[PDB]
Amino acid sequence: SSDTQQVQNILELEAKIPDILSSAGKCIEAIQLNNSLEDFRKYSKEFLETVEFISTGLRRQALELEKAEVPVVSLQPKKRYASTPLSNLIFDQSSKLI
Amino acid sequence: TEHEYYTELVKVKEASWPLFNSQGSNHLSVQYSCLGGISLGLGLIRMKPESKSFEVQSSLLYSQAALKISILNKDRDEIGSSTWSWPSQNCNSVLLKDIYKLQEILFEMDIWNSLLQEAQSCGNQGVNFTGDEILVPISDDHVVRITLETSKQEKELLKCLCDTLNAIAHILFLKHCRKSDRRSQQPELYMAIDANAPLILRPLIFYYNLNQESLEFQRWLKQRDISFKFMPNYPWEKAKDFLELENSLSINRLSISWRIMVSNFEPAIFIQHTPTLHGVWRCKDQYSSNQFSSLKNVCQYIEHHINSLSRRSKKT
Amino acid sequence: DNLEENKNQSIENADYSFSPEDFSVVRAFMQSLHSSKEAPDV
Amino acid sequence: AKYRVFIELHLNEEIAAAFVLQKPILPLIYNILHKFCLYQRLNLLSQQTFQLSRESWLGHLRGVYDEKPPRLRLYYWPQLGHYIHIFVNTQPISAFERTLSSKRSSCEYDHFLLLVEWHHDGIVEHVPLDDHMDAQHLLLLITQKHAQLILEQIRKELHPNIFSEHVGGGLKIHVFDNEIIVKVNSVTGRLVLSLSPPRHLRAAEKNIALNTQPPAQILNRLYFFCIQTQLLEVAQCAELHAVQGYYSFPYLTFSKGKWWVLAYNVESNSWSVRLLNAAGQTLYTQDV
Amino acid sequence: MQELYLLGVVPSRRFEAVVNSLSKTLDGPKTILEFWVVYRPKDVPPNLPRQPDSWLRLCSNIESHDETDTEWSKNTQWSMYLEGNSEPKREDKCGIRPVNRAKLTNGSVTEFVEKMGYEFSHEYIIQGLEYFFFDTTVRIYQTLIPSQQRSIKPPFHPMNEEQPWILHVYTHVADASNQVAMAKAEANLTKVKTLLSAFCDLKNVRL
């Protein structure tokens, strides 16, 4: 778990959310089309975990966002003047011209 | 739509690039000039459903740009030619290629800012600019004109000169980036004009007037055929890396001895030559030392010897 | 056009940079033109 | 393509508006077609000024654009300021009004122009415009005329003794020239001794930046001093030490060696001898 | 020379991130190593100010100089400081104290404090990095105890197992009388304060 990896973990969370719609619409459908209280007991029993796991997953990922201690405000960059790769790059072209 | 995007951002962040949020546009954006140079640069990663693959918007003018330099003739017909170039990249994605062309464009815009800005101060060496071009009057009626890109053996030799003029300007440019570190170099400031000039181009002129003058002098001696011993000692004669060669170009005095040979009996007249970059012909004979400026005075000074010493030959 | 959350964060100086500015002043073109067409009437 | 869309709309509205009211009919579109391309002409200029602010050439440029009918306010270098205005304008003339027409020749257009004011001169000259034109070139022509007026002014402030060509105040000193072209943008004339100039730079340009004294008395000092720079190089043979133990009057006082003391001199310029201590026998000659 | 100091504790637990941050938003880093010495006045009766800051502080860059040498104690470059107390009830805005950067060059260096009658007192080694910002500059502290008195042989002794890194923003006013220069300086430090407050908590501290 580092840098981008948590973001990828968030990708795992991403698939779950939209379905929460149809699942609810599935639950009602059990008392609707299926006309069955028991199957509604089932899918309603399933439906809540989509809520709980995602909610707790967010609260915990955010807690990770605090543990990482990434600053609340983006830093203003200095006008970077001479990272080495830029230097030996330009030098490389210099020899390339020579 | 979602998974397509932030994964691309992962593709860039994996390549280690700064990232920053924008205004209400809400897209994350690349600090494409991470290697830096002078000015900051940013670019939003615009979504491109039309091409699926993302493309980066930027305020930059020309899609392509480089610091072209060229040699005008007496009729200003072009002879030499050059254009700045970059080594090829091997990106896993088109977008990163766009980032590299982007950064190189910002870079060249900044180097143009440099030569244009110096072009103000260095005009007292005779540098000129109409704004759209930069005149550099020199010997044999020529102008080393310079312009940013919009939107038999002599040709090879001059092409090598173009390589020098083009590359070294960038090297010195990087040296200026090093000088932006703000050590505040007091002693040269009074040797300097106004004020924190890049000094990216002045030495380049300096070695040229040096070359032309020493050349003219040697031709002055050859015209009457007289022996002499030129004794160079360039700062760049000694370097173990480009970092030292970088410092080889400086405001330092450049002494040059000139043990001219005249009499087959009387001693050679030492002729020190020390052109300071800013802020020159010191004769020294059998009689006494002298300090000139114009080379012609040096010539007539020799003429006093070819005259009066000949009269000394006539004394007995 | 027609007419011309807390996401305030951005780099300070920005410049040199880019940021839309998706559109500007183009409305002011024609509208200055019609405000001016009525000018002789005024 | 948005321009091909949004523009046609309102114009097609007004074409109907011609029939909603009195008949004009066509020319009303024509006028609207100009100020459009004229107003953009300001933006395409005004925005460029900002490019000359945030980028080169940095400061001394901040022409604010205005929300009213458009109004630029370019500024310049500090000097105890100075500004240009630019506007569209309407100037009907009879000379075409009757001599033309009755043909494929419009009566009223009417009307559109491009003002270019040139203040702090009292001239307010209406300099010609002719595309291509940029935010730069205006400023260039303006600095040219303005600074050249400063050149001719100082030329009036210069001594009669030192004649100068109209080319740019390029005053002579036998024989070497001292061109004094004014620096573009910020002043302090970029004079060129003649290639690469010696220390007089700091004595001049940087000293001119000091702002103290008129840019003339200093130049007078330069004309006074450079001749000495020549003669001292010519002073090497025959040690004309130019001892100042006599007097610092303009006539000058060379000495002699290797030995009351005679005092060879030059001033007019002409050959001259004035042994003195005191002030003894004197006489003049004119060779070469 | 009225210095405008600032202070900022850095836990060592998070110290590297601060470095990676500052390097990407400031000039430098430039390497910092130095060997303080204090030589104590010893005179009675008062009025001797005999203040804890009144004790003199000679300073000497030692980094470029090689560790193996033992005669560095005089051969090395040296300087002298006073650093008076910060002005009273100075909060919010940075504290301000007088400072005087003396220098000297002779084979006789340390001896002079005895020539003033001063004798050896407490001493400590500093290590860290400096960061330029035009005029203003920020240096980060580590007050390592030397392995031996006047010895330059590593390891040097930490005050504790987890020594805080002592961040220190400062700038050097040429003279107190110029409220204009004071304004430019307070402005620059204000901008620095804003610049790095995002990942650190600087504050004025009395001295």
Added chain:
Amino acid sequence: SFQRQLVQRTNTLNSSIDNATLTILSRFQDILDIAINEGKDKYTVAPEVYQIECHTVSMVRAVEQLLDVSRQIKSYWLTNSLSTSFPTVDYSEPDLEKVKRTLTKLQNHLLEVSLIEP
């Protein structure tokens, strides 16, 4: 202080999250209260329909709020500083020798060099 900033920010995030989830679950939960049919007056049924649709829209909206949070968090994970400057084409490390011979030769172009000597 540096701490309370991230802390309170975390408080904002948790607040928006709990509010969104509670919103969804509440709007769904009250539909069952609205679910009753028989025994109601014919007029009383009518508002309840609109209430159903509005509760549903409220649910989908809070669902949008969740993604709105997700984008925030993603933005926070990309606003952090890079560990290092990025690698590039360091390949073909440039020679120093040719540069010297070229500069020294061109500077000595048409010139009769005569060694050095002390």
